[PDB]
Amino acid sequence: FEEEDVICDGCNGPVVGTRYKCSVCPDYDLCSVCEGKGLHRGHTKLAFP
Ligand SMILES: [Zn+2]
Ligand SMILES: [Zn+2]
């Protein structure tokens, strides 16, 4: 079966916990650490569990 893996665009680490996905870009996500450092805040994001 096919598996979806989310990798953080800031640090290339796996997104464990909350996923901050850009609503503008295709396929841009941040982990909570990179989100907390303020990456990519020129675009609205969705934060899902
Ligand atoms: Zn990260
Ligand atoms: Zn974006």
Numbering used by the authors: -3 to 45
Sentences from the paper on this structure:
Intriguingly, the autophagy adapter p62/SQSTM1/Sequestosome-1 was recently reported to recognize N-degrons, the N-end rule substrates of the well-characterized UPS, and where ultimately these substrates are delivered to ALS8,9. p62 is a key selective autophagy adapter that plays a role in the degradation of various cellular constituents such as misfolded proteins and their aggregates, malfunctioning organelles, and invading pathogens. Intriguingly, it was recently reported that the central ZZ-domain in p62 plays a critical role in the recognition of N-terminal arginylated BiP/GRP78 by the Arg-tRNA transferase ATE1. Here, we present the high resolution structures of the ZZ-domain of p62 in complex with 8 different N-degrons including type-1 and type-2, and subsequently identify key determinants involved in the unusual recognition.
However, an understanding of the manner by which the ZZ-domain binds to type-2 substrates is problematic since there is no deep hydrophobic pocket in the ZZ-domain, which is known to be involved in the recognition mode for type-2 N-degrons. Therefore, we determined the structure of the ZZ-domain in complex with a variety of N-degrons comprising three type-1 N-degrons and five type-2 N-degrons. As described for the R-BiP complex, two aspartic acid residues, Asp129 and Asp149, bind to the α-amino group, and Asp147 forms a hydrogen bond with the first peptide bond, which means that these interactions are conserved in all different N-terminal residues. However, the side chain of the N-terminal residue of the N-degron is recognized differently. Furthermore, the hydrophobic side chain of Ile127 guides the orientation of the side chain of the primary residue. Furthermore, the phenyl ring of the phenylalanyl peptide is properly oriented for van der Waals interactions. Our structural information clearly explains the affinity measurement data as well as previous pull-down assay results showing that type-1 N-degrons and only a subset of type-2 N-degron peptides (Phe, Trp, and Tyr) displayed binding affinity with p62.
